[PDB]
Design a protein around this motif. Structure first.
Motif, PDB file in Angstrom:
ATOM      1  N   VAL A   1      56.474   3.590  40.294  1.00  0.00           N
ATOM      2  CA  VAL A   1      55.238   4.352  40.489  1.00  0.00           C
ATOM      3  C   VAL A   1      54.696   4.806  39.130  1.00  0.00           C
ATOM      4  O   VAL A   1      55.456   5.255  38.272  1.00  0.00           O
ATOM      5  CB  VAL A   1      55.432   5.572  41.423  1.00  0.00           C
ATOM      6  CG1 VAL A   1      54.164   6.444  41.463  1.00  0.00           C
ATOM      7  CG2 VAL A   1      55.798   5.125  42.831  1.00  0.00           C
ATOM      8  N   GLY A   2      53.382   4.679  38.953  1.00  0.00           N
ATOM      9  CA  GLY A   2      52.704   4.983  37.704  1.00  0.00           C
ATOM     10  C   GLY A   2      52.122   3.715  37.110  1.00  0.00           C
ATOM     11  O   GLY A   2      52.297   2.639  37.679  1.00  0.00           O
TER      12      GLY A   2
ATOM     13  N   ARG B   1      52.889  -6.069  38.375  1.00  0.00           N
ATOM     14  CA  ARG B   1      52.533  -4.864  39.129  1.00  0.00           C
ATOM     15  C   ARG B   1      53.299  -4.745  40.451  1.00  0.00           C
ATOM     16  O   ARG B   1      53.805  -3.674  40.776  1.00  0.00           O
ATOM     17  CB  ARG B   1      51.015  -4.831  39.379  1.00  0.00           C
ATOM     18  CG  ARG B   1      50.517  -3.686  40.261  1.00  0.00           C
ATOM     19  CD  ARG B   1      50.498  -2.320  39.596  1.00  0.00           C
ATOM     20  NE  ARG B   1      51.821  -1.697  39.522  1.00  0.00           N
ATOM     21  CZ  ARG B   1      52.035  -0.429  39.176  1.00  0.00           C
ATOM     22  NH1 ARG B   1      51.020   0.375  38.886  1.00  0.00           N
ATOM     23  NH2 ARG B   1      53.271   0.042  39.125  1.00  0.00           N
TER      24      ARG B   1
ATOM     25  N   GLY C   1      61.841   4.627  47.623  1.00  0.00           N
ATOM     26  CA  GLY C   1      60.772   3.689  47.318  1.00  0.00           C
ATOM     27  C   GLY C   1      59.732   3.505  48.412  1.00  0.00           C
ATOM     28  O   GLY C   1      58.540   3.430  48.123  1.00  0.00           O
ATOM     29  N   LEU C   2      60.170   3.430  49.665  1.00  0.00           N
ATOM     30  CA  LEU C   2      59.249   3.304  50.796  1.00  0.00           C
ATOM     31  C   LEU C   2      58.405   4.575  50.924  1.00  0.00           C
ATOM     32  O   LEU C   2      57.256   4.524  51.332  1.00  0.00           O
ATOM     33  CB  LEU C   2      60.010   3.022  52.089  1.00  0.00           C
ATOM     34  CG  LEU C   2      60.801   1.712  52.106  1.00  0.00           C
ATOM     35  CD1 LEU C   2      61.610   1.619  53.383  1.00  0.00           C
ATOM     36  CD2 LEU C   2      59.888   0.505  51.962  1.00  0.00           C
ATOM     37  N   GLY C   3      58.990   5.713  50.567  1.00  0.00           N
ATOM     38  CA  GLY C   3      58.220   6.914  50.328  1.00  0.00           C
ATOM     39  C   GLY C   3      57.462   6.694  49.036  1.00  0.00           C
ATOM     40  O   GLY C   3      57.224   5.560  48.613  1.00  0.00           O
ATOM     41  N   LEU C   4      57.094   7.761  48.363  1.00  0.00           N
ATOM     42  CA  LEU C   4      56.331   7.590  47.139  1.00  0.00           C
ATOM     43  C   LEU C   4      57.171   7.894  45.899  1.00  0.00           C
ATOM     44  O   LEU C   4      56.655   8.362  44.899  1.00  0.00           O
ATOM     45  CB  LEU C   4      55.046   8.414  47.218  1.00  0.00           C
ATOM     46  CG  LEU C   4      53.826   7.543  47.522  1.00  0.00           C
ATOM     47  CD1 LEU C   4      52.633   8.397  47.906  1.00  0.00           C
ATOM     48  CD2 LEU C   4      53.500   6.662  46.329  1.00  0.00           C
TER      49      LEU C   4
ATOM     50  N   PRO D   1      56.370  -6.468  41.988  1.00  0.00           N
ATOM     51  CA  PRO D   1      57.524  -7.373  41.951  1.00  0.00           C
ATOM     52  C   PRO D   1      58.044  -7.680  43.351  1.00  0.00           C
ATOM     53  O   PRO D   1      58.127  -6.782  44.189  1.00  0.00           O
ATOM     54  CB  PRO D   1      58.560  -6.582  41.143  1.00  0.00           C
ATOM     55  CG  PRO D   1      58.186  -5.166  41.341  1.00  0.00           C
ATOM     56  CD  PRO D   1      56.694  -5.138  41.438  1.00  0.00           C
TER      57      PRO D   1
ATOM     58  N   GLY E   1      55.020   3.152  49.995  1.00  0.00           N
ATOM     59  CA  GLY E   1      54.456   3.672  48.754  1.00  0.00           C
ATOM     60  C   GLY E   1      54.354   2.648  47.629  1.00  0.00           C
ATOM     61  O   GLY E   1      53.404   2.671  46.848  1.00  0.00           O
ATOM     62  N   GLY E   2      55.336   1.757  47.538  1.00  0.00           N
ATOM     63  CA  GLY E   2      55.293   0.652  46.593  1.00  0.00           C
ATOM     64  C   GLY E   2      55.633   1.098  45.184  1.00  0.00           C
ATOM     65  O   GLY E   2      56.072   2.238  44.999  1.00  0.00           O
ATOM     66  N   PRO E   3      55.404   0.254  44.176  1.00  0.00           N
ATOM     67  CA  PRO E   3      54.659  -1.003  44.290  1.00  0.00           C
ATOM     68  C   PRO E   3      55.516  -2.251  44.553  1.00  0.00           C
ATOM     69  O   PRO E   3      54.978  -3.358  44.472  1.00  0.00           O
ATOM     70  CB  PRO E   3      54.030  -1.120  42.905  1.00  0.00           C
ATOM     71  CG  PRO E   3      55.122  -0.612  42.007  1.00  0.00           C
ATOM     72  CD  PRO E   3      55.852   0.476  42.794  1.00  0.00           C
ATOM     73  N   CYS E   4      56.804  -2.094  44.843  1.00  0.00           N
ATOM     74  CA  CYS E   4      57.641  -3.244  45.177  1.00  0.00           C
ATOM     75  C   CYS E   4      57.254  -3.792  46.543  1.00  0.00           C
ATOM     76  O   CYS E   4      57.044  -3.021  47.475  1.00  0.00           O
ATOM     77  CB  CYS E   4      59.126  -2.853  45.211  1.00  0.00           C
ATOM     78  SG  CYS E   4      59.878  -2.585  43.598  1.00  0.00           S
TER      79      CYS E   4
ATOM     80  N   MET F   1      48.368   5.163  45.410  1.00  0.00           N
ATOM     81  CA  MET F   1      49.389   6.127  45.023  1.00  0.00           C
ATOM     82  C   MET F   1      50.430   5.520  44.080  1.00  0.00           C
ATOM     83  O   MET F   1      50.967   6.225  43.229  1.00  0.00           O
ATOM     84  CB  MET F   1      50.071   6.717  46.264  1.00  0.00           C
ATOM     85  CG  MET F   1      49.154   7.559  47.139  1.00  0.00           C
ATOM     86  SD  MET F   1      48.351   8.886  46.224  1.00  0.00           S
ATOM     87  CE  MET F   1      49.749   9.909  45.775  1.00  0.00           C
ATOM     88  N   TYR F   2      50.696   4.218  44.210  1.00  0.00           N
ATOM     89  CA  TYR F   2      51.651   3.541  43.323  1.00  0.00           C
ATOM     90  C   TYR F   2      51.173   3.505  41.873  1.00  0.00           C
ATOM     91  O   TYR F   2      51.984   3.341  40.973  1.00  0.00           O
ATOM     92  CB  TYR F   2      51.987   2.112  43.800  1.00  0.00           C
ATOM     93  CG  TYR F   2      50.810   1.166  43.929  1.00  0.00           C
ATOM     94  CD1 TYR F   2      50.176   0.643  42.805  1.00  0.00           C
ATOM     95  CD2 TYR F   2      50.344   0.779  45.183  1.00  0.00           C
ATOM     96  CE1 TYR F   2      49.099  -0.225  42.927  1.00  0.00           C
ATOM     97  CE2 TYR F   2      49.276  -0.085  45.314  1.00  0.00           C
ATOM     98  CZ  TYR F   2      48.653  -0.579  44.182  1.00  0.00           C
ATOM     99  OH  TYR F   2      47.589  -1.432  44.317  1.00  0.00           O
ATOM    100  N   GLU F   3      49.864   3.625  41.649  1.00  0.00           N
ATOM    101  CA  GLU F   3      49.316   3.683  40.285  1.00  0.00           C
ATOM    102  C   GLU F   3      49.599   5.008  39.584  1.00  0.00           C
ATOM    103  O   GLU F   3      49.481   5.094  38.370  1.00  0.00           O
ATOM    104  CB  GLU F   3      47.800   3.443  40.279  1.00  0.00           C
ATOM    105  CG  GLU F   3      47.390   1.986  40.356  1.00  0.00           C
ATOM    106  CD  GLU F   3      47.849   1.152  39.167  1.00  0.00           C
ATOM    107  OE1 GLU F   3      47.972  -0.082  39.336  1.00  0.00           O
ATOM    108  OE2 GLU F   3      48.085   1.707  38.069  1.00  0.00           O
ATOM    109  N   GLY F   4      49.944   6.038  40.352  1.00  0.00           N
ATOM    110  CA  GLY F   4      50.269   7.344  39.805  1.00  0.00           C
ATOM    111  C   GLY F   4      49.188   8.389  40.030  1.00  0.00           C
ATOM    112  O   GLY F   4      49.295   9.496  39.514  1.00  0.00           O
TER     113      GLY F   4
END
Lengths: 282, 272, 285
Positions: free
Chosen positions: C148-149, C158, C140-143, C160, B196-199, B87-90
């Motif tokens: 994101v993307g 990718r 952020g912990l959500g989506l 951090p 969810g990320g990507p951190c 999901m973090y990729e979009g």
């Protein structure tokens, strides 16, 4: 695809409704769990399908906007509500509440179905919302995200007395005087976006966050109501007892959820009617 | 973003794959950590690129195309996803859901998934296996559940329960196999929470998640699990602890072993 | 979603700005609560309205466009964002990210940010400065993480890490400057949690957040910090405590944005002074 819930669009919808009815409602009711039969009790009524109101959102037979009298008071009743797990937009959920405001609504009353996190709760209990945790809202999916519609309210609405304490007090008094005060509690409602029921680990976390009940609705409508100065009464019917244990065979079943709602529906409706009867009249 | 994961679109994708292969898979496998492993040991393999299937989602370049490998592992027919959708990729809900619903139509009854995760539980070490016995779907609670939108009734119900989501008999068997083969000391069970990320998670986030009852944290898996349970596929899931989380601001290797574990679990799985 | 914050678009914006000014900024500053006057006191300042920069995101205060201000502050070259981009307004991830990535290409090495926050920690007082030493990015912990993307590899990796997101040496210097100048009693360090907003936090929400280990709550800053850390800019961030969070529903106390604005207006003089004196002693130069 939906129309922005700005003053221009909301006025257009409201004006169209005002040509179909002269009834100026002072109480808006959203029918959730336990209020499936509320429309029956509305006297001198006029049922307006959502399909007949241009730019009004559509949900399922079509939902209806019902104007009429309930306990001697002018009401507008949403039969058919808009859940975010269905894929509806913020503007879609907001518009009907803002329409209510322009029509004259001063008090929003709402029921919903919820899982009982609090271990003292029993199946079929009523939990009056005294507060909420808006998990979507904290996570950037608050219904008010986007430009603020100033005709309706302020950029940063406070939610300090969101669940009007005087309406909660009256609801409790009506229950106690009519012999079902033992079914009535007050608590914190947390919104799970849905549509999955909550896992045991999720329920355990939510209970430890100070939550009494969990559900998939209502908070968005409450925020829009408070944003435009509508007083709010909201109550959860406990339709499942949450399972916190992963090794337990117990589980939420949607048919049992619906059965509990329908069983309590006469009482919930009677309660709402007797609250409206006792509301202060000016 | 892509095509809707309804019964017609998923039927079309499944029907094309069935022309390219006669193998009717009983077990689906998603490789998150042990990608270079597991896809090798499949006997009589049939590598089918994602590009060779129309409407099936495609990975984003990177010099490594995704593949759907059919074959047999320890006497059972399987289908392995080599290349996940995060999901973090979009990617959209339908994009992540479609592959799992294709597995259902292909005949999959059990989904086995591995991933990489940060350890929150203080007793965990690097390299530990953590079988998921439950999850916390933070994006799901916050209105980013993969099932948001119209319900595809042909796959499942509007409001799915997540009871025994991580099948307790599959976890029991996976533990039995690990201890029988010497590496039982590495195996734990716990709750996986999705970021969810990507951190990567901050110390304060890790502290909050630990106190929420979470043992590991990662950026995948839950969305697929939800889709799998929605359409009645039993799930076994395991995290490899690839980072130990620091809790205060003041303060590859197991690829072969996890591959062997998965192979031996499938060996002992009951067959209809 | 507007223009993507990729290397090509960000470069185009940065080059447009470099034609309008010869100041190569070392320090970027986002003016949140308490920093209204700091922008005002930049020496030899060139003011560039956001309207005059093609593909730079647009934000206004009731019609008046924000400004990018170049100049010096305590002898150090700065770029000041007067006007910021909050996610509750409906701005995209790319919109919020682009200004920070533009700062990177202009030469910015350190980002300083202020904001308004509710005080969850019960020891906090109205007007206190809470230096961020960590955060909890609930969106952020959500989506709804700003990254994101597809990852823009030109700017960063990718996944951090955010281990020393709020630079510990900058935090130590900020505390030292406050101590030496006689207002150390007003300065705390804490964990900031982002509420997407724009609703203020309910009593039940505040109680939950407090029990999570959060010291202050606000609706901004973390997205910018994530973009800054992603592209290797060191970060110093401070919350001004503009409301004391109410934890019980049985209470007439509420958060009102006017008193929030009054706290920012009244502490702006001291916060400006604090930031100027920090900048005077920053490392590298």
């Amino acid at each position: 695809e939906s129309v922005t819930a700005n003053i221009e669009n909301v006025k257009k919808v409201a004006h169209h409704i005002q040509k179909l009815t002269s009834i100026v409602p002072e109480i808006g009711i959203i029918c959730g769990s336990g209020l499936g039969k509320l429309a029956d009790g509305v006297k001198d009524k006029i049922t307006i399908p959502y399909t007949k109101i241009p730019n009004f959102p559509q949900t399922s037979h079509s939902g209806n906007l019902i104007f009429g009298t309930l306990s001697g008071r002018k009401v507008v009743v949403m039969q058919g509500r808009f859940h975010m797990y269905e894929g509806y937009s913020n503007d879609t959920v907001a518009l009907p509440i803002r329409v209510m405001k322009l029509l004259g609504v001063k008090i929003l009353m709402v029921s919903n179905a919820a899982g009982g996190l609090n271990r003292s709760l029993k199946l079929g209990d009523f939990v009056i919302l005294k507060d909420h945790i808006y998990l979507p809202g904290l996570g950037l999916n608050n219904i008010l995200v986007g430009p603020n519609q100033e005709a309706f309210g302020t950029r940063f609405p406070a939610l300090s007395n969101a669940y009007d304490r005087d309406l909660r007090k009256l609801a409790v008094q009506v229950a106690e005087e009519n012999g079902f005060g033992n079914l009535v509690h007050q608590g914190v409602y947390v919104m799970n976006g849905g549509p999955c029921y909550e896992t045991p680990a999720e329920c355990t976390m939510l209970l430890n966050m100070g939550c009494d009940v969990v559900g998939m609705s209502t908070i968005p409508e409450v925020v829009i109501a408070r944003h435009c100065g509508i007083q709010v009464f909201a109550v959860s019917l406990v339709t499942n007892i949450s399972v916190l244990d992963v090794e337990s065979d117990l589980k939420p079943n949607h048919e049992e959820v619906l059965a509990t709602g329908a069983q309590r529906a006469e009482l919930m409706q009677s309660w709402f009617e007797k609250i409206i009867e006792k509301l202060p009249k000016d």
